[PDB]
Write an enzyme that holds these catalytic residues in place. Structure first.
Site, PDB file in Angstrom:
ATOM      1  N   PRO A 263       0.782  -1.244   0.000  1.00  0.00           N
ATOM      2  CA  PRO A 263       0.000   0.000   0.000  1.00  0.00           C
ATOM      3  C   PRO A 263       0.820   1.306   0.000  1.00  0.00           C
ATOM      4  O   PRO A 263       1.139   1.833   1.076  1.00  0.00           O
ATOM      5  CB  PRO A 263      -0.869  -0.115   1.263  1.00  0.00           C
ATOM      6  CG  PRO A 263      -0.749  -1.563   1.706  1.00  0.00           C
ATOM      7  CD  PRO A 263       0.622  -1.998   1.251  1.00  0.00           C
TER       8      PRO A 263
ATOM      9  N   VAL B 117       1.454   5.456  -1.688  1.00  0.00           N
ATOM     10  CA  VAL B 117       0.828   6.569  -2.420  1.00  0.00           C
ATOM     11  C   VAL B 117       1.775   7.256  -3.400  1.00  0.00           C
ATOM     12  O   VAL B 117       1.369   8.153  -4.136  1.00  0.00           O
ATOM     13  CB  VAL B 117       0.286   7.670  -1.488  1.00  0.00           C
ATOM     14  CG1 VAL B 117      -0.883   7.147  -0.693  1.00  0.00           C
ATOM     15  CG2 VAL B 117       1.394   8.171  -0.588  1.00  0.00           C
ATOM     16  N   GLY B 118       3.034   6.837  -3.401  1.00  0.00           N
ATOM     17  CA  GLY B 118       4.016   7.415  -4.301  1.00  0.00           C
ATOM     18  C   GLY B 118       5.116   6.398  -4.520  1.00  0.00           C
ATOM     19  O   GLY B 118       5.166   5.392  -3.823  1.00  0.00           O
TER      20      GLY B 118
ATOM     21  N   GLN C 143      13.632   3.516  -6.279  1.00  0.00           N
ATOM     22  CA  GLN C 143      13.090   2.567  -5.313  1.00  0.00           C
ATOM     23  C   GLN C 143      12.981   1.131  -5.841  1.00  0.00           C
ATOM     24  O   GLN C 143      12.876   0.182  -5.061  1.00  0.00           O
ATOM     25  CB  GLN C 143      11.751   3.081  -4.767  1.00  0.00           C
ATOM     26  CG  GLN C 143      11.933   4.304  -3.893  1.00  0.00           C
ATOM     27  CD  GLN C 143      10.676   4.707  -3.146  1.00  0.00           C
ATOM     28  OE1 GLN C 143       9.699   5.160  -3.751  1.00  0.00           O
ATOM     29  NE2 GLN C 143      10.689   4.545  -1.820  1.00  0.00           N
TER      30      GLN C 143
ATOM     31  N   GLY D 115       6.302   8.677   5.746  1.00  0.00           N
ATOM     32  CA  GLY D 115       6.885   7.351   5.824  1.00  0.00           C
ATOM     33  C   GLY D 115       7.335   6.955   4.436  1.00  0.00           C
ATOM     34  O   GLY D 115       6.712   7.331   3.445  1.00  0.00           O
ATOM     35  N   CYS D 116       8.418   6.201   4.349  1.00  0.00           N
ATOM     36  CA  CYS D 116       8.921   5.784   3.058  1.00  0.00           C
ATOM     37  C   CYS D 116       8.897   4.275   2.994  1.00  0.00           C
ATOM     38  O   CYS D 116       8.980   3.599   4.021  1.00  0.00           O
ATOM     39  CB  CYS D 116      10.337   6.291   2.859  1.00  0.00           C
ATOM     40  SG  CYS D 116      10.996   5.957   1.243  1.00  0.00           S
ATOM     41  N   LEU D 117       8.778   3.750   1.782  1.00  0.00           N
ATOM     42  CA  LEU D 117       8.716   2.310   1.578  1.00  0.00           C
ATOM     43  C   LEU D 117      10.107   1.694   1.646  1.00  0.00           C
ATOM     44  O   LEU D 117      10.262   0.477   1.730  1.00  0.00           O
ATOM     45  CB  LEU D 117       8.047   2.032   0.230  1.00  0.00           C
ATOM     46  CG  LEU D 117       6.733   2.819   0.118  1.00  0.00           C
ATOM     47  CD1 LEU D 117       6.221   2.799  -1.309  1.00  0.00           C
ATOM     48  CD2 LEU D 117       5.708   2.238   1.074  1.00  0.00           C
TER      49      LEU D 117
ATOM     50  N   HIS E  31       8.113  14.264  -1.763  1.00  0.00           N
ATOM     51  CA  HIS E  31       8.717  13.023  -1.307  1.00  0.00           C
ATOM     52  C   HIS E  31       9.381  12.306  -2.462  1.00  0.00           C
ATOM     53  O   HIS E  31      10.591  12.096  -2.458  1.00  0.00           O
ATOM     54  CB  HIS E  31       7.660  12.105  -0.719  1.00  0.00           C
ATOM     55  CG  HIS E  31       8.226  10.884  -0.054  1.00  0.00           C
ATOM     56  ND1 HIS E  31       8.607  10.879   1.272  1.00  0.00           N
ATOM     57  CD2 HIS E  31       8.470   9.646  -0.532  1.00  0.00           C
ATOM     58  CE1 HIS E  31       9.061   9.673   1.583  1.00  0.00           C
ATOM     59  NE2 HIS E  31       8.991   8.906   0.515  1.00  0.00           N
ATOM     60  N   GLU E  32       8.573  11.941  -3.457  1.00  0.00           N
ATOM     61  CA  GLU E  32       9.049  11.218  -4.641  1.00  0.00           C
ATOM     62  C   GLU E  32      10.159  11.955  -5.377  1.00  0.00           C
ATOM     63  O   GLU E  32      11.125  11.342  -5.826  1.00  0.00           O
ATOM     64  CB  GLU E  32       7.895  10.957  -5.610  1.00  0.00           C
ATOM     65  CG  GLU E  32       6.612  10.465  -4.950  1.00  0.00           C
ATOM     66  CD  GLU E  32       6.854   9.419  -3.866  1.00  0.00           C
ATOM     67  OE1 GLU E  32       7.551   8.414  -4.129  1.00  0.00           O
ATOM     68  OE2 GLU E  32       6.337   9.606  -2.747  1.00  0.00           O
TER      69      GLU E  32
ATOM     70  N   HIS F  12      13.468  11.582  -3.717  1.00  0.00           N
ATOM     71  CA  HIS F  12      14.065  10.296  -4.076  1.00  0.00           C
ATOM     72  C   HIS F  12      14.925  10.416  -5.328  1.00  0.00           C
ATOM     73  O   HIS F  12      16.045   9.909  -5.390  1.00  0.00           O
ATOM     74  CB  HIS F  12      12.968   9.259  -4.328  1.00  0.00           C
ATOM     75  CG  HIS F  12      12.419   8.649  -3.078  1.00  0.00           C
ATOM     76  ND1 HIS F  12      13.085   7.656  -2.378  1.00  0.00           N
ATOM     77  CD2 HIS F  12      11.297   8.909  -2.372  1.00  0.00           C
ATOM     78  CE1 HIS F  12      12.393   7.340  -1.306  1.00  0.00           C
ATOM     79  NE2 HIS F  12      11.301   8.085  -1.271  1.00  0.00           N
TER      80      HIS F  12
HETATM   81 ZN   LIG Z   1       9.706   6.985  -0.396  1.00  0.00          ZN
END
Ligand SMILES: [Zn+2]
Ligand SMILES: [Zn+2]
Lengths: 191, 191
Positions: free
Chosen positions: B45, B47-48, B53, B109-111, B152-153, B156
Site C-alpha cells: 500500500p 501513495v508514491g 526505489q 513514511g517511506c517504503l 517526497h518522490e 528520491h
Molecule cells: Zn519513499
C-alpha cells in the site's frame, strides 16, 4: 518479570531524564533497575543501554563489550574503530565531556531503532564523571568504541537518538550495512 | 515479474538519478518501468514511488491517492493534512518548485524505510513540470497531501530520504505513531 525495550515514539526516549539522588543509588529500588538494564543489554545483543530504554526516566547507563561480541566482526574494522573489550560498567547521573575535538565516523545502531544502522560522528576521546553502582563518585576516561558507547547512552539520557545526528544518506538496513556509501558521504575512520 | 523495493543502504537510493530522454519515453523499456512502478506502488500500500526505489537510476515518479486509502484514516486528520484523493499520475523528468513558502508539518513514511514514520516539514503549495506517461510536456499544480507526496518522490530522484529532513525526536515506530510528541517538539499542522 522483565521490562522490555521502548522503541522510538515513546516520549520517555525523547525527553531529558531526571537525575537519581546520590545515596538513593544504594537503594534496593534503583539497584534493581541497574540489574534489569544489565540483563536486557545482554538479553538482546547490546553493548550499551540507558534507563529510558526500559521506561525509566532516570540518569543511569550500563555499557560492556565482550571479547566475544568483538570476535564476530572484521578484525580490519574492529581495529580501525579501536574497539577493545571492557567489563560491565554502571554510571548514575553521568556527565560526559570530550577530552579533545578529535572525532571518528562509524556505523551506530540503537536498540530503540532496530533493523537500522547509520554513520554517526563521535568524539574519539572523552571523560565521564558521576557515580558508580554503589553510590561512590567515579570519573571514567575512555576513547575508541567505548567513548562512542558512552556518548550514545548519555545522549539517551537527554532524549536524543543517533537518527537526529546521522550523516545524510548513511541510514540503512542492517542487511545493506556493508553496501557502499554513495558519492559525497564522508569517509569512515578518523583523523 | 515485479521488482522488489530497495531499502536504505542500496546506493541507487542515495544518488541523483539521470534524466530519461524525452521521446525515449514512449520506448518499450521505459514504458515497461512505469508499469512496474505503478504495480509496486499499488502492491504494497503506497501513495508514491520513485524509479530508484525499484533500482532504476532514472527520473520517473508515480503517485496516486485512492478514495479508499484515505477512507482508512481519521477524517479529522485527513482534514488537517488537506488530503484529497487524486487519480494515478505519472511524471518523467519532473522538476518541482514551491508556489509559496507556505509549509506544513505531518508524519511521513517511506517504503525504503518501513516500520518507521517521522514528522517532516513540506511546502504546502507546489508546481511540477516535466513529461506525462506519453512523453508530452505537462505542468502539475498541487497542494496539501498531494504536494507532500510530489516532494517526497522528487526527493528520491535526488538521493534524499525524509530521514535527513525530519524534525528531531519525531522519529518513531509505526506502532508508537500516535504516542505524544516529546516536549520541545513543534506542533503538527500548518501556520
Ligand atoms: Zn519513499
Ligand atoms: Zn540506543
Amino acid at each position: 518479570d522483565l521490562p522490555e525495550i521502548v522503541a522510538s515514539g515513546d516520549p520517555v526516549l525523547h525527553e531529558k531524564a531526571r537525575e537519581v539522588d546520590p545515596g538513593e543509588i544504594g537503594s534496593e529500588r534503583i539497584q534493581k533497575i541497574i540489574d534489569d538494564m544489565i540483563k536486557v543489554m545482554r538479553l538482546a545483543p547490546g553493548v550499551g543501554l540507558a534507563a529510558p530504554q526500559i521506561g525509566v526516566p532516570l540518569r543511569i547507563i550500563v555499557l560492556e563489550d565482550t571479547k566475544e561480541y568483538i570476535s564476530y566482526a572484521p578484525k580490519e574494522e574492529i581495529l580501525a574503530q579501536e574497539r577493545r573489550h571492557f567489563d560491565l560498567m554502571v554510571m548514575v547521573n553521568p556527565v560526559l565531556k570530550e577530552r579533545s575535538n578529535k572525532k571518528a565516523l562509524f556505523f551506530e545502531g540503537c536498540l530503540s531503532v532496530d533493523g537500522f544502522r547509520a554513520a554517526v560522528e563521535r568524539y574519539l576521546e572523552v571523560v565521564v564523571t558521576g557515580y558508580d553502582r554503589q553510590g561512590k563518585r567515579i570519573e571514567v576516561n575512555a576513547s575508541g568504541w567505548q567513548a562512542r558507547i558512552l556518548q550514545h547512552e548519555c545522549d539517551h539520557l537527554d532524549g536524543n537518538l543517533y537518527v537526529d545526528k546521522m550523516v545524510p544518506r548513511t541510514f540503512r538496513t542492517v542487511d545493506n550495512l556493508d553496501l557502499p556509501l554513495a558519492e559525497g558521504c564522508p569517509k569512515l575512520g578518523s583523523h
